[PDB]
Design a protein around this ligand. Structure first.
Ligand code: HEM
Ligand code: HEM
Lengths: 441, 443
């Protein structure tokens, strides 16, 4: 009944607890101390961080809870607008864009994106096989190059050409700076605000240009010509730009974190890497992986799911109670009461996964049916779950599969996991050396 | 390319090779001679026995191979029906029961079964401490008493009370004779069939009775079967499949597990250093009169002992696969769609390229770090979504029971028992007997 709350800071309540560069990990440590639920108060806001499958499975009841816009999401809404990720479920443009865009993210739609995913994946592999001796790989940097280019290419046939740059594409640099500003205001300026609007313009001008410029096999085509079966309406141009902005953000950084964490856990667990590398070798018998071969990379997918278990790169989502309801039979919630699902802690729930929750064990996902309901939520929940899950997973499986096929990897620095936090998670400074297996493409 | 084939018998092809009392061990010797793969032909059937991890890791690719119903399983299907073990993956009742029953077999659901496992384990321990001096233990017999009662109690809140009997429960004798007829039917070209139907009825009537008897809510498999709804179809199991699952879980829940404990204890008394190390772990971990669930999980070496026992003698010694599509096995054995494979698990577990030269030695330390074992090298519980749903059940039960056995008794191989592996559809060390000197630790 009496809900635990972490230390307060006078009138600031718990807000300064987020005044840290690693708020998710700070929240997880708080979850370690306080348990499955703790109240988090900030000036003018109360939320509850859920960390157990017991409570989160109720929070995932869409008849009782709907997606809430966290303060993080509300600030991403400043440039993602009513894009899919920053729109409320009851906003007409969410279900509209949902129905319009869901066929473009089906498992069957991955077949159309596969070639362009390979295009970028080949560029990644070519970059690494072209490295000189003793040179190392900046993993999250290269994973972001790949995921950004993959969503750019697969999403609206735009080549960010990140592998031709060291300084990222002006869109990416503005987007990150905006996202950073979006995060800074959570734990918080006319220079910041003008820069924010300028970064908004840099993002929007690119996007808005390409909409006017444009049949490719991409998300933009479906956005330009797709009609919502419900309303019969297509997305208007302002929402299409918001979706592109949404897909550029939501399409790259969580996926690059996944690949970065996956490779980190692989090089930290050589036996797991060996299983994954040997599967990659046995399955990817062609110079270019086919869609079906990527689907055949069962273990690589398990590696990715386990990476998503330990470090879900979109580490939280927010919910609000649609009506008065009792959470877990002991925590009464009033209509509109907010919940935060602390996904990394949920994925460390000892009652679901056993005691070895901190161990990287892909075999937890041999049989996905075995995972209890709502125990594994790296892609969110219900109709507001990640529309790009199959995209992210297909890309990450394809890329990780090719990486393991073509290179032996060395944790040459004995890298100490340092998880940099934006709105997503990434192992900062994670570097490896890759010894090419000299398998041509 | 050209697949080896063992000796043939004219029109019977290789079938008379299975007309033997130890067909698995016969197949292992054949695998010893012919290697990682051999074609096995019988009238109206061709299959291929795989024995190397190299080929079995491909056979375990669920995108290429799905569980096949071996002729044994096809005959067990006569009374296990479309229960989980004898149903095809594409049968609606498989995925239904799969999704419905997986929560009842989670490692977290083992916590709910633990007390009833202890209930039976304590009965086993008290039976042995109540033996008089110089009296011996019939090991597989008592392991079957325990595993049958544990699945009976944990599965459907039914007490077979096997420790109150010398002649096993009428269900078991009917079940064994059914399995006997099912196994004997492999070599079949009216009294046998009438007896077979009667044994089915003995099983069905009891099972159906408890289903009809069961509105008490127990913490068992039967509750999940009666109230569980498949999240996919939204459907519960109907009563005809629930009866098949109980029959399935009664068969699949005890004898393979009892064989494990029987083989485990066999290898322990045959390896006193392994026994002492496991016994010392039991003493260090089982500090309470009744083992807790967490203490069982801490019996790491006991768990390694069981895995090594499952390595040498996987008590469900084979499973069958069929090629979902045309595919090439090992880059040299082209398979047509529907082509059958048998995974000869004991031979797989003797793959020198995986385990080293000492594959016949009982060395639980092989399992110190399970991560080190390559994929599909150790398959005592089958493969993929068709793997043993009760693996964690069997292992928790066996670890708990073996842990308590090692805590409470010093064991003597007083006959210097010569391993004689009885073959039904499972493996057990027939006639394996020990003496237990009680350590006089109360419960
Ligand atoms: C490993 C990679 C990814 C992870 C971990 C991830 C995670 C998530 C999570 C947790 C949510 C729910 C957020 C919330 O409820 O507030 C979400 C939603 C979303 N994601 Fe992802 N995502 C990934 C990749 C992608 C990709 C590749 C795309 C696009 C191509 C994408 C687009 C979206 C969109 C549009 C939504 C909002 C869906 C809606 O509400 O209708 N994501 N994602
Ligand atoms: C050491 C003990 C055990 C061993 C070695 C073992 C082994 C196996 C193997 C190899 C399979 C796959 C057979 C095939 O693919 O044709 C299997 C399946 C199965 N086992 Fe076990 N098992 C054991 C204990 C148990 C227990 C304790 C239960 C129930 C509580 C159980 C219930 C089942 C079921 C229902 C299946 C079929 C699963 C499915 O196809 O969905 N087994 N077992």
């Amino acid at each position: 009944k009496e809900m635990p709350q972490p230390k307060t800071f006078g009138e600031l309540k718990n807000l300064p607890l987020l005044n840290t560069d690693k708020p998710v990990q700070a929240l997880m440590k708080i979850a370690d101390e306080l348990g499955e639920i703790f109240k988090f108060e900030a000036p003018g806001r109360v939320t509850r961080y859920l960390s157990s499958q017991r409570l989160i499975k109720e929070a995932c009841d869409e008849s009782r809870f709907d997606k809430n816009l966290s303060q993080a999401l509300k600030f991403v809404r400043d440039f993602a607008g009513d894009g899919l990720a920053t729109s409320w479920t009851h906003e007409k443009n969410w279900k509209k864009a949902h129905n319009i865009l869901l066929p473009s993210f089906s498992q069957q739609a991955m077949k159309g994106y596969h070639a362009m995913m390979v295009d970028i994946a080949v560029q990644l592999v070519q970059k690494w096989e072209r490295l000189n001796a003793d040179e190392h790989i900046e993993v999250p940097e290269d994973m972001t190059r790949l995921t950004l280019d993959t969503i750019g290419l697969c999403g609206f046939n735009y080549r960010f050409n990140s592998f031709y740059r060291d300084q990222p594409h002006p869109f990416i640099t503005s987007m990150v700076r905006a996202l950073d500003e979006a995060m800074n205001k959570l734990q918080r300026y006319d220079e910041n605000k003008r820069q924010f609007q300028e970064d908004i313009k840099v993002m929007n001008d690119l996007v808005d240009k390409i909409i006017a410029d444009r049949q490719s096999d991409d998300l933009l085509t479906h956005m330009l010509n797709g009609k919502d079966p419900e309303t019969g309406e297509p997305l208007d141009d302002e929402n299409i730009r918001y979706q592109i902005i949404t897909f550029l953000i939501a399409g790259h950084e969580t996926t690059s974190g996944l690949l970065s964490f996956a490779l980190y856990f692989l090089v930290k667990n050589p036996h797991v890497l060996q299983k994954a590398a040997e599967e990659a070798a046995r399955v990817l018998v062609d110079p270019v992986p086919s869609y079906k071969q990527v689907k055949q990379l069962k273990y690589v997918g398990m590696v990715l799911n386990e990476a998503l278990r330990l470090w879900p790169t979109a580490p939280a989502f927010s919910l609000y109670a649609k009506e008065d309801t009792v959470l877990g039979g002991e925590y009464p919630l009033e209509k509109g009461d907010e919940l935060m699902v602390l996904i990394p802690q949920l994925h460390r729930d000892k009652t679901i996964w056993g005691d070895d929750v901190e161990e990287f064990r892909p075999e937890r996902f041999e049989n996905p049916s075995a995972i209890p309901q709502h125990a594994f939520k790296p892609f969110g929940n219900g109709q507001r779950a990640c529309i790009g899950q199959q995209f992210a997973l297909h890309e990450a499986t394809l890329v990780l599969g090719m990486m393991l096929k073509h290179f032996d990897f060395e944790d040459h620095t004995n890298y100490e996991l340092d998880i940099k936090e934006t709105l997503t998670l990434k192992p900062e400074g994670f570097v490896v050396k890759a010894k090419s297996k000299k398998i041509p493409l």
